[PDB]
Each structure stands twice: as C-alpha cells, then as structure tokens.
Design a protein around this motif. Structure first.
Motif, PDB file in Angstrom:
ATOM      1  N   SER A 131       0.848  -1.223   0.000  1.00  0.00           N
ATOM      2  CA  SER A 131       0.000   0.000   0.000  1.00  0.00           C
ATOM      3  C   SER A 131       0.874   1.261   0.000  1.00  0.00           C
ATOM      4  CB  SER A 131      -0.964  -0.001   1.162  1.00  0.00           C
ATOM      5  OG  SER A 131      -0.274  -0.094   2.398  1.00  0.00           O
ATOM      6  N   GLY A 132       2.073   1.188   0.588  1.00  0.00           N
ATOM      7  CA  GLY A 132       2.991   2.335   0.731  1.00  0.00           C
ATOM      8  C   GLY A 132       2.614   3.225   1.904  1.00  0.00           C
ATOM      9  N   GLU A 133       1.565   2.862   2.649  1.00  0.00           N
ATOM     10  CA  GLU A 133       1.117   3.573   3.874  1.00  0.00           C
ATOM     11  C   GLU A 133       2.243   3.594   4.908  1.00  0.00           C
ATOM     12  OE1 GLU A 133      -3.327   2.756   5.065  1.00  0.00           O
ATOM     13  OE2 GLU A 133      -2.463   0.937   4.162  1.00  0.00           O
ATOM     14  N   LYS A 134       2.403   4.718   5.605  1.00  0.00           N
ATOM     15  CA  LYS A 134       3.211   4.796   6.846  1.00  0.00           C
ATOM     16  C   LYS A 134       2.376   4.172   7.964  1.00  0.00           C
ATOM     17  CE  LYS A 134       3.932   9.272   6.459  1.00  0.00           C
ATOM     18  NZ  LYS A 134       3.260   9.313   5.137  1.00  0.00           N
ATOM     19  N   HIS A 135       3.022   3.499   8.911  1.00  0.00           N
ATOM     20  CA  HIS A 135       2.333   2.868  10.066  1.00  0.00           C
ATOM     21  C   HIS A 135       3.340   2.651  11.193  1.00  0.00           C
ATOM     22  CE1 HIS A 135       4.103  -1.161   9.419  1.00  0.00           C
ATOM     23  NE2 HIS A 135       4.308  -0.618   8.237  1.00  0.00           N
ATOM     24  N   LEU A 136       2.843   2.520  12.418  1.00  0.00           N
ATOM     25  CA  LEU A 136       3.674   2.077  13.560  1.00  0.00           C
ATOM     26  C   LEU A 136       4.289   0.733  13.187  1.00  0.00           C
ATOM     27  CD1 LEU A 136       1.979   2.871  16.972  1.00  0.00           C
ATOM     28  CD2 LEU A 136       4.049   3.824  15.935  1.00  0.00           C
ATOM     29  N   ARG A 137       5.546   0.516  13.549  1.00  0.00           N
ATOM     30  CA  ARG A 137       6.241  -0.748  13.212  1.00  0.00           C
ATOM     31  C   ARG A 137       5.575  -1.860  14.026  1.00  0.00           C
ATOM     32  NH1 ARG A 137       9.611  -1.744   9.908  1.00  0.00           N
ATOM     33  NH2 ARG A 137      11.190  -3.400   9.847  1.00  0.00           N
ATOM     34  N   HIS A 138       5.404  -3.032  13.416  1.00  0.00           N
ATOM     35  CA  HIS A 138       4.777  -4.230  14.030  1.00  0.00           C
ATOM     36  C   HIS A 138       3.268  -4.014  14.229  1.00  0.00           C
ATOM     37  CE1 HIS A 138       9.136  -4.970  15.215  1.00  0.00           C
ATOM     38  NE2 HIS A 138       8.805  -6.091  14.618  1.00  0.00           N
ATOM     39  N   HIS A 139       2.700  -2.898  13.766  1.00  0.00           N
ATOM     40  CA  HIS A 139       1.230  -2.654  13.784  1.00  0.00           C
ATOM     41  C   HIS A 139       0.714  -2.645  12.347  1.00  0.00           C
ATOM     42  CE1 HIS A 139       2.395  -1.362  17.678  1.00  0.00           C
ATOM     43  NE2 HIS A 139       1.228  -0.832  17.995  1.00  0.00           N
ATOM     44  N   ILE A 140      -0.559  -2.986  12.149  1.00  0.00           N
ATOM     45  CA  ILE A 140      -1.202  -2.989  10.804  1.00  0.00           C
ATOM     46  C   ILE A 140      -1.414  -1.528  10.401  1.00  0.00           C
ATOM     47  CG2 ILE A 140      -2.303  -5.164  11.445  1.00  0.00           C
ATOM     48  CD1 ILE A 140      -4.914  -3.835  11.666  1.00  0.00           C
ATOM     49  N   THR A 141      -1.619  -1.247   9.114  1.00  0.00           N
ATOM     50  CA  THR A 141      -1.876   0.124   8.603  1.00  0.00           C
ATOM     51  C   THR A 141      -3.338   0.501   8.859  1.00  0.00           C
ATOM     52  OG1 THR A 141      -2.548  -0.407   6.345  1.00  0.00           O
ATOM     53  CG2 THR A 141      -0.171  -0.318   6.781  1.00  0.00           C
ATOM     54  N   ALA A 142      -3.696   1.761   8.606  1.00  0.00           N
ATOM     55  CA  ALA A 142      -5.075   2.290   8.737  1.00  0.00           C
ATOM     56  C   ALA A 142      -5.990   1.632   7.696  1.00  0.00           C
ATOM     57  CB  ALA A 142      -5.074   3.792   8.592  1.00  0.00           C
ATOM     58  N   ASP A 143      -5.495   1.424   6.469  1.00  0.00           N
ATOM     59  CA  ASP A 143      -6.272   0.829   5.348  1.00  0.00           C
ATOM     60  C   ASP A 143      -6.512  -0.658   5.630  1.00  0.00           C
ATOM     61  OD1 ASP A 143      -5.867   0.625   1.670  1.00  0.00           O
ATOM     62  OD2 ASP A 143      -7.661   0.485   2.948  1.00  0.00           O
ATOM     63  N   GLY A 144      -5.605  -1.311   6.363  1.00  0.00           N
ATOM     64  CA  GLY A 144      -5.794  -2.691   6.851  1.00  0.00           C
ATOM     65  C   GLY A 144      -4.726  -3.656   6.365  1.00  0.00           C
ATOM     66  N   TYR A 145      -3.570  -3.154   5.923  1.00  0.00           N
ATOM     67  CA  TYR A 145      -2.422  -3.963   5.436  1.00  0.00           C
ATOM     68  C   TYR A 145      -1.456  -4.238   6.591  1.00  0.00           C
ATOM     69  CZ  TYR A 145      -3.825  -3.291   0.562  1.00  0.00           C
ATOM     70  OH  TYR A 145      -4.515  -3.292  -0.627  1.00  0.00           O
ATOM     71  N   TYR A 146      -0.718  -5.346   6.514  1.00  0.00           N
ATOM     72  CA  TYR A 146       0.463  -5.625   7.370  1.00  0.00           C
ATOM     73  C   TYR A 146       1.467  -6.485   6.597  1.00  0.00           C
ATOM     74  CZ  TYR A 146       3.475  -6.805  11.276  1.00  0.00           C
ATOM     75  OH  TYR A 146       4.567  -6.945  12.097  1.00  0.00           O
ATOM     76  N   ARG A 147       2.659  -5.933   6.347  1.00  0.00           N
ATOM     77  CA  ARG A 147       3.793  -6.594   5.647  1.00  0.00           C
ATOM     78  C   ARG A 147       3.328  -7.103   4.277  1.00  0.00           C
ATOM     79  NH1 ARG A 147       6.763 -10.610   9.855  1.00  0.00           N
ATOM     80  NH2 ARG A 147       7.887 -10.932   7.883  1.00  0.00           N
ATOM     81  N   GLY A 148       2.494  -6.321   3.583  1.00  0.00           N
ATOM     82  CA  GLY A 148       2.035  -6.599   2.205  1.00  0.00           C
ATOM     83  C   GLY A 148       0.656  -7.239   2.137  1.00  0.00           C
ATOM     84  N   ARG A 149       0.255  -7.993   3.169  1.00  0.00           N
ATOM     85  CA  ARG A 149      -1.024  -8.754   3.210  1.00  0.00           C
ATOM     86  C   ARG A 149      -2.147  -7.831   3.701  1.00  0.00           C
ATOM     87  NH1 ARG A 149      -3.017 -12.670   7.428  1.00  0.00           N
ATOM     88  NH2 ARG A 149      -0.822 -12.645   8.139  1.00  0.00           N
ATOM     89  N   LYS A 150      -3.316  -7.882   3.058  1.00  0.00           N
ATOM     90  CA  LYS A 150      -4.553  -7.158   3.467  1.00  0.00           C
ATOM     91  C   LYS A 150      -5.310  -8.028   4.479  1.00  0.00           C
ATOM     92  CE  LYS A 150      -8.201  -4.235   2.736  1.00  0.00           C
ATOM     93  NZ  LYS A 150      -8.203  -2.777   3.005  1.00  0.00           N
ATOM     94  N   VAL A 151      -5.095  -7.806   5.783  1.00  0.00           N
ATOM     95  CA  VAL A 151      -5.489  -8.761   6.867  1.00  0.00           C
ATOM     96  C   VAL A 151      -6.923  -8.477   7.332  1.00  0.00           C
ATOM     97  CG1 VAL A 151      -3.066  -8.972   7.587  1.00  0.00           C
ATOM     98  CG2 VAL A 151      -4.620  -7.504   8.907  1.00  0.00           C
ATOM     99  N   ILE A 152      -7.312  -7.208   7.483  1.00  0.00           N
ATOM    100  CA  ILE A 152      -8.697  -6.819   7.888  1.00  0.00           C
ATOM    101  C   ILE A 152      -9.360  -6.098   6.711  1.00  0.00           C
ATOM    102  CG2 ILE A 152      -7.965  -6.646  10.300  1.00  0.00           C
ATOM    103  CD1 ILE A 152      -8.425  -3.569  10.040  1.00  0.00           C
ATOM    104  N   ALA A 153     -10.694  -6.007   6.731  1.00  0.00           N
ATOM    105  CA  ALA A 153     -11.516  -5.240   5.767  1.00  0.00           C
ATOM    106  C   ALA A 153     -11.760  -3.833   6.328  1.00  0.00           C
ATOM    107  CB  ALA A 153     -12.810  -5.969   5.493  1.00  0.00           C
ATOM    108  N   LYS A 154     -10.849  -2.897   6.025  1.00  0.00           N
ATOM    109  CA  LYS A 154     -10.865  -1.474   6.471  1.00  0.00           C
ATOM    110  C   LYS A 154     -10.726  -1.404   7.998  1.00  0.00           C
ATOM    111  CE  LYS A 154     -14.820  -0.510   4.361  1.00  0.00           C
ATOM    112  NZ  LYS A 154     -15.965   0.321   3.917  1.00  0.00           N
TER     113      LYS A 154
END
Ligand SMILES: *[C@H]1O[C@H](CO)[C@H](O)[C@H](O)[C@H]1NC(C)=O
Ligand SMILES: [Mg+2]
Ligand SMILES: [Mg+2]
Ligand SMILES: [Mg+2]
Ligand SMILES: [Mg+2]
Ligand SMILES: [Mg+2]
Ligand SMILES: [Mg+2]
Ligand SMILES: [Mg+2]
Ligand SMILES: [Mg+2]
Ligand SMILES: [Mg+2]
Ligand SMILES: [Mg+2]
Ligand SMILES: [Mg+2]
Ligand SMILES: [Mg+2]
Ligand SMILES: [Mg+2]
Ligand SMILES: [Mg+2]
Ligand SMILES: [Mg+2]
Ligand SMILES: [Mg+2]
Ligand SMILES: [Mg+2]
Ligand SMILES: [Mg+2]
Ligand SMILES: [Mg+2]
Ligand SMILES: [Mg+2]
Ligand SMILES: [Mg+2]
Ligand SMILES: [Mg+2]
Ligand SMILES: [Mg+2]
Ligand SMILES: [Mg+2]
Ligand SMILES: [Mg+2]
Ligand SMILES: [Mg+2]
Ligand SMILES: [Mg+2]
Ligand SMILES: [Mg+2]
Ligand SMILES: [Mg+2]
Ligand SMILES: [Mg+2]
Ligand SMILES: [Mg+2]
Ligand SMILES: [Mg+2]
Ligand SMILES: [Mg+2]
Ligand SMILES: [Mg+2]
Ligand SMILES: [Mg+2]
Ligand SMILES: [Mg+2]
Ligand SMILES: [Mg+2]
Ligand SMILES: [Mg+2]
Ligand SMILES: [Mg+2]
Ligand SMILES: [Mg+2]
Ligand SMILES: [Mg+2]
Ligand SMILES: [Mg+2]
Ligand SMILES: [Mg+2]
Lengths: 110, 48, 19, 142, 103, 117, 150, 56
Positions: free
Chosen positions: H33-56
């Motif tokens: 996604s290219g989103e900035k995020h806290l390290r070891h935390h999922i992004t706001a859009d719902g990505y973590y380490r490339g994988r889309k883990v949650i739906a928003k």
RNA sequence: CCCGGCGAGGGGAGUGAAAAAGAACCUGAAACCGUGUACGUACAAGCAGUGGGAGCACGCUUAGGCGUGUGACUGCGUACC
RNA sequence: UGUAACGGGGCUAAACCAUGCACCGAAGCUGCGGCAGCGACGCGCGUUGUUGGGUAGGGGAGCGUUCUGUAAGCCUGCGAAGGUGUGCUGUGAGGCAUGCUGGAGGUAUCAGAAGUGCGAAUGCUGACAUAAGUAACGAUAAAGCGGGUGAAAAGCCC
C-alpha cells in the motif's frame, strides 16, 4: 511568508498541551503531521487540527506550497480558568480550576 | 495685587502634625505616643 | 480574598494535654 | 587610571622542580603555597591564578621536627556514623607519601574554586623521577 | 616619558597627551595649570626620583572640562529601629589634558 | 475630596522594581522582596565604598612586596627606606610602577637600600 | 452603613483575623473611618480687619491705575449692545462698575457680558475688587464707599 | 507534611526536565500500500507486511 | 471564501478613523505563564547582594575608547517587621 | 554524631621571657573636593571657629496626591490623562524632556481645603501562584465480543 492559526479557549491546561507542541517546533509540516498522528495524547489531536488549519490558511489565503512549509513558531498561552466547587469531606469545599489554553501555530516557507 | 499673588505673612500658617505617615516625618509608626500602656491607646489617658 | 470560615467540624485527634 | 589586573588568558606560568629531601614539611609547604598562588609576582591578582607549576620530588623523604614523625595524627571522617579514621605521619609516609605534602599545601591555599585550581599546578612525586621533561622545569632551592 | 605628580590629595602617573580626572581645580575650562611638585619622571633608563620633588620638575596641563561624576546613592538603615536615611552625591571633577612634562 | 492612590503607588513600586533589575527571582519581580533587596544593596554599597579603599591598598602592598622581594628587600624595609630617603610616591603608584616599569622600580629599591645603608 | 451587628465568625479557632462587624472600615463596603459630616467653613472676620482690607485694596487699585473714577455711567435702554459699545469706547473689557443707585437698565445690559459686573457701593466685596482688571466707580459711589469705610 | 517555603519556578522547571515526550523514532512504510504505520502494527487501510489482513 | 464535526476556534475578505475597537469588545498596570534572542551555568556549598573583575555579544561619533546586556573568578556579607 | 581545649594549615619557633628597630592595621587622625547646623566678626553677603551616630521623643524645613480660586486664562486631535521605555536632573521626597502605546482631556503660578502617601494589622476584596500534572475519580455486583450510529464508541443503540 508567515501564516497563523489559533485554537483559543482549548479545553486542556497549557502544561499538558506544551508537551506536544515541543515535539513539532521547527519540523517540516509533513514530518510534524506524522509525529502528531502517533502521539497518544488528547493535546496531539488539539494541535494537529490547528496545524492542519494553519497549512490550509497558508494554501488558500497566501499562495504557499505545503511541501515548503515548516512549523516556524508554536506556543500555548494559559486561557481563562473556569472555577468550579468540589465538595470535600466534613462539609468543606475546594475550588477546582478547569484550565483552558490558547494554541497558536505559525507555518512559513522560511 | 491679583488673586494669584496674595501670600500670608511668614509664620502665620504652621502645617499641622500628620502622625503615622512613615519614618522620614519623625511621627511614623507610634505617632509620638511611645510604646504601649494606657496613654498609647485610642481614647486612652487618665482623667483630670 | 478569603471564604467565610467553617463552623467547628469533627477532629481526628485530641489536642495533647500538657497538664 | 585603574589598578592593573592579571588576565587569565595572558599570564606566564613557569615550571619549577623542588627536592623535598630533608626539607621541614611546614616551611616547604608555605614556599609552595606562596608560588602556587603567585604571591612572588608583581602581577599578583587575588582572583587570577598567576602562580607557577611546581614538581615536588622525594616527597617520601620530607622531614618533621620533634616527635611529629610518630605523634602527628591525620584525621578524616568517611561520612559514615563512627567513620573517624586516623593515620600517624609515619603511616601516611609508608602508605601514600605524596598526600603529606599535598595535605600540608592544601590547608595553606585559598579555599573555593581558584584555591582548587591553584592546587592542580602542584605535581608531587614520592621518588626522584618525574614525567614532565617536556615542560623543561627549572630547579628551585626552597 | 611618564611623570608622577600630586593633586587633590591623590597621586597620578601621566604621559603627554593623557586626559586625567582630578579633584575640582579653581581654574577656567580653557586655562593651563602647572604641576610643579613632581615626584618622579622616567624616560626608559633615565629616571628622576624626587626627594620628595624633582628639582625643576614641571607638568603643564590644559583644563579641558569641569563636571559632576556619576550619582552615588548613600543608604543608611538600622533594621528593627525605625531608622532609614537616603542621600544622593555627585563628586565634582576637573579633566586636565597633560601638554608637557619637563625635568 | 477623595484621593485615589493608584498612580503614585504604581510609580513608587516601579522606582524600586527598576533598581532591583538583575536580582534573582522574587527579588526582581515582587515589590515586598525587591524593596528589602534594594535597601540591602544600598547598605552594602555604603559599606563597600570604604572596603574598596582597604582592598586596593592591600592589593598594592602585596604587589610592592612581590616586586621588592624580587629586588632582594622586604616591603617593610623598602617602605622604611623610601621614608628615610624622603620619597613620597604613594603605594597606588609604586604598585603601578612594579608592574609596568620594573627598571624604575629597581631604581626606587636602590634609593631605599641607600637610605638604610 | 447598612448591615447587621452580627460578628461575622467566632472570635477563636477559625485561623482568620478576628472580626467584629462587616461594617469595619478595614473591610471592603465598610464604614469610612472618619466620615465627613456637613461643615460650616465660614470664618469670623473682625469688622475693623474687613474695613482695613477694603482700604488696602482700594489704595492699591489707585496705585496700579485700576480705579477709573467717572461722574456719570449709564446706558439709554436695557440693551447689551449699548454697554458693550460704551466699554470698547472707554477702552476696557474686564471691569467692575460700582454705581450709586443700581440702574435697572445698566444691570440688565451687563448681565450677559461675563467679563462685566455692575454693583451698588453697598455691594463691594474684597474678592471682586481684586478679581476684575479695572474698577469703574461713579463719583457718587466713591462718596458712599468713603462714608461706608470712614 | 507540606512545604515550609514556596519552591521556585526554577525548581519546578528542573523537576519537569524529564517530562518531555519522545517522538516515535520513525514510521515504517508498507511494501504494498505504501502507507506509513507504527512498526509491528497494521496500517489504517488494513495492510500488514504486504497482506490485506482486515476489511478497512 | 477557506480549515474544522452542516462544530468550537481560527485565517482571509469586507465595514470602520481604528477590529492588537469583533461583542470574552475604551484604556489595558502588576502578580502569574509562555515563545524568541544574548551572555552565563553540569568539581560546585549558605539572606543570593555588594566591592573588585576576566571573557563574550551588541550599539555607537577616535576604529577607537565609550555606552548596553551578561558575570567566570575573588574580598565582604545570617531577610524585613 | 566527627579531628574537635592554637579558627585551620602547619610550627621546635611560626613557642615563652627580655631588649630594640621596622612595617601592617579602623568609618580614629591627616590630605583633597563637596553639603549642612550653630556661634563669632565684619557687611543679604563674605571671613573665621566649631559641630553634623541615633530609639522613644521634641524642634525645624520640604516633596507629591485629589479638590476650590487665579482660569471663558493657558496646553491639547500637528495627540490630553493614563500605560510603557529611554535620557537628563536635584541632598531627599521628587522634577524635566522624549520614543512607543493611548484617543480627550489636562492645567502653570501663587494661595485655599484634605477621604493626602501602606509591606506588614493570623488586616478587607479581587486576581494569580505553590504543593502537582501529585492525591483522587465515591462501595472489589464484572465483564467479553459482534453489529449499528458517528468526526470520534470501554461507557450510547441492537
Ligand atoms: C477532636 O478534638 C476536639 C476538640 O477540638 C474534641 O476533643 C474531640 O473529641 C476530638 N476527637 C478526637 C477523635 O480526638
Ligand atoms: Mg454533608
Ligand atoms: Mg523619633
Ligand atoms: Mg507596637
Ligand atoms: Mg513597656
Ligand atoms: Mg507610655
Ligand atoms: Mg475604642
Ligand atoms: Mg488579601
Ligand atoms: Mg576566607
Ligand atoms: Mg474624584
Ligand atoms: Mg520584570
Ligand atoms: Mg460605602
Ligand atoms: Mg456683621
Ligand atoms: Mg518556619
Ligand atoms: Mg515528571
Ligand atoms: Mg465561526
Ligand atoms: Mg471615545
Ligand atoms: Mg480592551
Ligand atoms: Mg503584562
Ligand atoms: Mg573536587
Ligand atoms: Mg565547570
Ligand atoms: Mg547549594
Ligand atoms: Mg562570607
Ligand atoms: Mg570521638
Ligand atoms: Mg606605617
Ligand atoms: Mg582608612
Ligand atoms: Mg572622621
Ligand atoms: Mg560624628
Ligand atoms: Mg542626626
Ligand atoms: Mg482629572
Ligand atoms: Mg490650580
Ligand atoms: Mg488614606
Ligand atoms: Mg498593597
Ligand atoms: Mg510597617
Ligand atoms: Mg490554593
Ligand atoms: Mg495520570
Ligand atoms: Mg509529591
Ligand atoms: Mg504517588
Ligand atoms: Mg492513584
Ligand atoms: Mg464510580
Ligand atoms: Mg467531540
Ligand atoms: Mg462494541
Ligand atoms: Mg463500564
Ligand atoms: Mg447490552
């Protein structure tokens, strides 16, 4: 070219809001917006809205590029204290100060 | 002789004592009554 | 300024008796 | 005009080496304390260290008069309750002999920061050899 | 060259072309003064020590200004004894410009 | 005729607060504390105009004692010498010469030494 | 001062300065320590000292050429324009006009000229004799002021 | 127990010499996604380490 | 018009002689709280000043002293009522 | 409590006695400049002598504040009072000038009258500090999760 945004009569003691303002004083707006986003303080929310407004002010009013803005000045002045009665033991009263603050952010290309 | 050139005779208008108005005046603090006892008190003093 | 003082309230400890 | 004051960025401190061998502790200390402060110089200012550097050699051989060798007692307190320690002069000379000159000179120097800065220009040694050949110290007969 | 003369109960070590602040002299702001009682004159190696003055020692000075020095507040205060007294003071001086030292 | 004290009291307090500039804490901010401090500064100033004369003479003597002992005589002998030889150059000047003209000072020490000889 | 005589709090135990009345002059809203009453500021002036002072003032009004004595001073009709005209001709602005019997017309004419006052000899006060630049006395009036002061 | 003497604004300042907040060292950037995020935390859009883990 | 929660609050615009007269409104002191700059301060003991005094910064009209700020170091110094 | 009965360092003199000669040392004395009080003598001004630590307290002389007259004058929108700087000035209370603020008052002089001067009164009223971002958030019946609404949901709705 300096642009200003104030939140006047912000619910929060200056002391509390000053902890946050010290983080972004002298930073690029982009760098500062990020810092505030990941600062787990009520004051970070308060100051991010005033910094966002300042950037908006500096884009719309003055023809300034958001990419070039830095947080030049930031400071928090003590606002009016709202006075409240707090009942204590043995029918004695304390007088609680609900401390308000004035948050001023100045962004500039300089 | 105009209303702003009439002066009183020298020695005709001695200025009254003002007590308890500071060290300079020489009547500050106790105002000439000294320290304590009946004569220092408001309405103090023995009868004739 | 100062608030009007309270009437006597209950005391946690007795004043020590020097006598 | 105003009286001259020595300026601490333009003052000419010089290196001297003294042999304490046989010298009376006190009478050596005063001459050291005098030169450390700069009380032997016209430019003597009471708030500027105008004094000289003094290497003292053979500290271990410094002399005392009477029965002071056994009976002069050096007291200190550790700051711990009951922490009153004592050493005779001969014990001090046996264990840490540089301290005997250093202690004597230190009681004869101004107290306070400058007093402490002055004392820093006294290099005491227990032997006959110093490391300061580079400083080219002049011999001084006290 | 420098010379040592006494004026206004004080001594001064002066060289030609020096302005010198003395105690008030009674001499106009243009007039010259001669300091005759001279205690020393020095020309490097040559040094004339008065006993107590140097025979034919003279310092010709031009009076350049009179004036009153910086104000000094005199404060007297006896704590607990209801006594306080303040007084101002500016001391008069006379700036002389040394025109010639002669032995 | 009622007199409000505002303007005059303001000016008295400012007068004192201005004299307390540079003082630490309440001493430069708080009339009650600035006043005490301005008085005590006054008392020290009076006391020290005297002490200044004592401290400078003491300095001058120390420097003359250095310069004289360099020339192989104590301050006490030297000053006694200067009186016997009828030299009247005061300690402020001697001290000034001891620093600035060491040749001249040696001259003075010789004149001293002569009188005692 | 309006309020009760109730002691605001008990004498001892509160930790506050002892108080007795809410009307204490130490208190905001309290009495004035030495409250003014209406005063008579009138002084006695000895008859002879009053007459003395009049004689001193008149004698000065002659020495400074301020007492301009005429024989007859009146106006035709009660018109301010007439007296203003008469005063510019006689060459004075600020003036006290002492006449024998107070002529109604000259009284009315002067009334609205603030620099001009018009009195009968019985009505000379010392302050008015000093206050006005020039005093115009009618010969008739001087006789009365003489008779009045003796 | 209470103060015998008002502490100074200096002494207050000195005690707060440790009260300063630490800004997050640096945000991590999601590889996808290219989103900035806290390290070891999922992004706001719902990505973590490339994988889309949650739906928003 | 713009940021913001169809907020609070603010920035423009406009009115006005003036909006740092914007309604929490004439002036707008002091305590008290901040931002910025200069100098000092992490081996140093106490009424915190005072007398001495280096260094640094600044402003001037000899390019020089002079003024201003700061005050290492050092003598003396236990508030007021 | 700690050397702790030379102020310390140190001292065999840097101790003690005797004699001597130097020097240091106070706001004492002297010198230089200045101010004031009192008495002398001249003639208001010289000259000379001398005095000037001070609580209670007595005596003398002043500063400044508001108000009345002087003033229908004088200063003031070309900027009053007040505020805040700076400079100068007097032995002091003080005074004068002036930058900025302020936006309509101010007031010489000489007299007159006082609600006329504040640091204290556990003084009074208002404001604001400190302790402190400390204690505490009121029964230890207890929460968990999903969905919804919303700028935001541990607390609201389901
Ligand atoms: C508290 O003190 C009061 C007096 O002020 C009474 O003596 C009361 O009985 C005391 N109570 C306690 C618990 O000692
Ligand atoms: Mg209850
Ligand atoms: Mg008295
Ligand atoms: Mg009493
Ligand atoms: Mg008694
Ligand atoms: Mg009595
Ligand atoms: Mg009574
Ligand atoms: Mg109060
Ligand atoms: Mg000492
Ligand atoms: Mg009024
Ligand atoms: Mg200040
Ligand atoms: Mg009333
Ligand atoms: Mg009658
Ligand atoms: Mg206590
Ligand atoms: Mg903390
Ligand atoms: Mg709005
Ligand atoms: Mg208006
Ligand atoms: Mg306002
Ligand atoms: Mg302010
Ligand atoms: Mg150390
Ligand atoms: Mg250091
Ligand atoms: Mg400390
Ligand atoms: Mg001390
Ligand atoms: Mg023991
Ligand atoms: Mg002597
Ligand atoms: Mg002396
Ligand atoms: Mg004397
Ligand atoms: Mg005396
Ligand atoms: Mg006296
Ligand atoms: Mg008025
Ligand atoms: Mg008037
Ligand atoms: Mg009053
Ligand atoms: Mg007050
Ligand atoms: Mg008092
Ligand atoms: Mg409180
Ligand atoms: Mg917390
Ligand atoms: Mg705590
Ligand atoms: Mg805790
Ligand atoms: Mg807790
Ligand atoms: Mg609860
Ligand atoms: Mg909300
Ligand atoms: Mg939920
Ligand atoms: Mg819950
Ligand atoms: Mg439910």
């Amino acid at each position: 070219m300096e642009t200003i945004a104030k939140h006047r009569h912000a619910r929060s003691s200056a002391q509390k809001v000053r902890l946050v303002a010290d983080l972004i004083r002298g930073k690029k707006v982009s760098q500062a917006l990020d810092i505030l986003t990941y600062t787990n303080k009520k004051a970070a929310v308060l100051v991010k809205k005033v910094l966002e407004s300042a950037i908006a002010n500096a884009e719309h009013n003055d023809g300034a590029d958001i990419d070039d803005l830095k947080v030049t000045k930031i400071f928090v002045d003590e606002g009016p204290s709202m006075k409240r009665i707090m009942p204590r033991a043995k029918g004695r009263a304390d007088r609680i100060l609900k401390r308000t603050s004035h948050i001023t952010v100045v962004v500039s290309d300089r | 002789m105009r209303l702003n050139t009439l002066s009183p005779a020298e020695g005709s208008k001695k200025a009254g004592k003002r007590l308890g108005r500071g060290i300079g005046s020489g009547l500050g603090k106790t105002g000439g009554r000294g320290h304590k006892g009946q004569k220092s008190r408001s309405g103090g003093g023995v009868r004739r | 300024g100062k608030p009007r003082p309270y009437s006597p309230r209950p005391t946690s400890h007795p004043r020590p008796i020097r006598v | 005009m105003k009286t001259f004051t020595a300026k601490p960025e333009t003052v000419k401190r010089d290196w001297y080496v003294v042999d304490a061998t046989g010298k009376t502790l006190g009478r050596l200390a005063t001459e050291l304390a005098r030169r450390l402060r700069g009380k032997h110089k016209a430019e003597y200012t009471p708030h500027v260290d105008t004094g000289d550097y003094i290497i003292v050699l053979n500290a271990d051989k410094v002399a005392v008069t009477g029965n002071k060798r056994t009976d002069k007692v050096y007291y200190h307190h550790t700051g711990h309750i009951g922490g009153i320690k004592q050493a005779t002069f001969e014990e001090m000379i046996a264990r840490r002999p540089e301290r005997v000159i250093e202690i004597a000179v230190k009681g004869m120097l101004p107290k306070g920061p400058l007093g402490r800065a002055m004392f820093r220009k006294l290099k005491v040694y227990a032997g006959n050899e110093h490391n300061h050949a580079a400083q080219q110290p002049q011999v001084l007969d006290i | 060259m420098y010379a040592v003369f006494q004026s206004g109960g004080k001594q001064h070590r002066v060289s030609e072309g020096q302005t010198v602040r003395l105690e008030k002299l009674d001499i106009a702001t243009g007039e010259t003064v001669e300091f005759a009682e001279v205690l020393m004159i020095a020309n490097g190696e040559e040094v004339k020590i008065g006993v107590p003055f140097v025979d034919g020692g003279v310092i010709k000075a031009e009076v350049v200004a009179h004036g009153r020095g910086e104000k000094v507040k005199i404060v007297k205060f006896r704590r607990r004894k209801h006594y306080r007294k303040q007084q101002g003071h500016r001391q008069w001086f006379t700036d002389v410009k040394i025109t010639g030292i002669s032995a | 005729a009622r007199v409000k004290r505002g303007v005059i009291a303001r000016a008295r307090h400012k007068k004192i607060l201005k004299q307390a500039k540079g003082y630490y804490g309440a001493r430069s901010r708080v009339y009650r504390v600035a006043f005490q401090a301005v008085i005590k500064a006054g008392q020290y100033a009076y006391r020290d105009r005297r002490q200044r004369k004592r401290q400078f003479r003491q300095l001058w003597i120390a420097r003359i004692n250095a310069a004289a002992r360099q020339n192989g005589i104590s301050y006490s002998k030297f000053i006694n010498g200067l009186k016997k030889a009828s030299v009247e150059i005061d300690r402020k000047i001697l001290a000034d010469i001891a620093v600035f003209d060491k040749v001249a000072f040696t001259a003075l020490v010789e004149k001293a030494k002569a009188a005692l000889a | 001062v309006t309020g009760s005589g109730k002691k605001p709090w008990r004498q001892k135990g509160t930790g506050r300065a002892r108080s007795g009345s809410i009307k204490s002059p130490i208190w905001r809203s309290g009495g004035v320590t030495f409250a003014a009453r209406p005063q008579d500021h009138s002084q006695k002036v000895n008859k002879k000292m009053y007459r003395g002072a009049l004689k001193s003032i008149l004698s000065e009004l002659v020495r400074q050429d301020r007492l301009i004595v005429v024989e007859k001073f009146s106006v035709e009709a009660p018109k301010t324009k007439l007296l203003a005209q008469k005063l510019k001709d006689m060459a004075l602005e600020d003036v006290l006009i002492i006449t024998g019997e107070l002529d109604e017309n000259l009284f009315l004419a002067a009334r609205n000229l603030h620099k001009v006052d018009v009195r009968d000899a019985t009505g000379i006060d010392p302050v008015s004799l000093i206050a006005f630049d020039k005093v115009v006395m009618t010969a008739d009036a001087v006789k009365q002021v003489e008779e009045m002061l003796a | 127990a209470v103060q015998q003497n008002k502490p100074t604004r200096s002494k207050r300042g000195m005690r707060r010499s440790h009260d300063a907040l630490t800004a997050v060292t640096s945000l991590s950037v999601d590889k996808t996604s290219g989103e900035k995020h806290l390290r070891h935390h999922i992004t706001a859009d719902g990505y973590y380490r490339g994988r889309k883990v949650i739906a928003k």
